[PDB]
């Protein structure tokens with residue numbers, strides 16, 4: 269495998285054990301393993317991560333060229349199950365917030381705006397994230413909202429502006445991805461729409477179903493229905509319909525959704541810190 273040497277090509281030099289100190293484990297059995305540490309010279313607290321190595325190559329390459337305030341920025345990488353340094357967001361994932369707390373429209377609008385700012389940046393740089401879900405939204409202790417997980421990323425171009433592979437997580441996948449049709453950046457808009465449903469209902473639609481049954485239900489049902497749409501303002505219902513539109517041409521882009529009236533009721537990001545406190549208490 270010559271893909272191991274293309275990985276080794278631009279990922280160093282230097283010993284990470286001397287640049288950063290006070291390594292504290294926070295990682296799980298997903299791979300693993302994630303640790304916090306502190307920059308010796310500046311005092312910055314950092315997040316350090318420790319089958320398919322090409323997803324790691326793609327992660328690094330896409331991350332270091334697409335730096336943005338709404339993306340969990342890549343800082344550095346080192347030697348050797350590899351050592352990837354990135355910014356630390358102590359508030360944890362949006363998943364704990366959506367499953368343990370009730371979010372108001374002001375707080376939802378604030379999270380949607382921050383995620384849409386990241387998406388308009390990625391789409392303008394021809395990057396389709398393809399794995400938008402609350403699990404890949406990290407929260408700062410100050411209410412910062414940042415996008416992570418660039419492994420399943422697709423770099424488009426005018427020559428080949430479409431993909432047709434089944435990539436992402438079933439419950440958040442656009443019907444055009446599910447049905448293996450030619451798709452583009454607007455698949456991330458659908459996934460954000462599904463993430464706004466998580467913020468309302470606690471779960472994406474069909475979570476109680478098996479991933480294949482959900483895949484079938486997305487293909488046959490199309491636009492998902494809320495359990496209680498009457499609970500939402502007409503402006504929020506309109507924002508959701510524009511995210512979850514079956515017709516790709518009718519579905520909003522990130523640039524045009526950033527102009528939606530729903531985002532005008534967005535609360536300051538500080539309005540998210542009680543949600544983080546509640547989610548930490550609920551999962552403690």
Ligand SMILES: Clc1c(CNc2nccc(Nc3cc(C4CC4)[nH]n3)n2)ccc2nc[nH]c12
Pocket residue numbers: 294295302315316317340354355356357358359360361403404405406416417
């Ligand atoms: Cl690794 C990872 C975690 C690790 N666990 C964790 N717990 C509490 C806080 C916190 N903050 C982080 C993490 C990161 C950089 C991505 C490593 N910066 N700040 N991370 C969680 C959700 C993920 N969703 C995708 N990857 C995720």
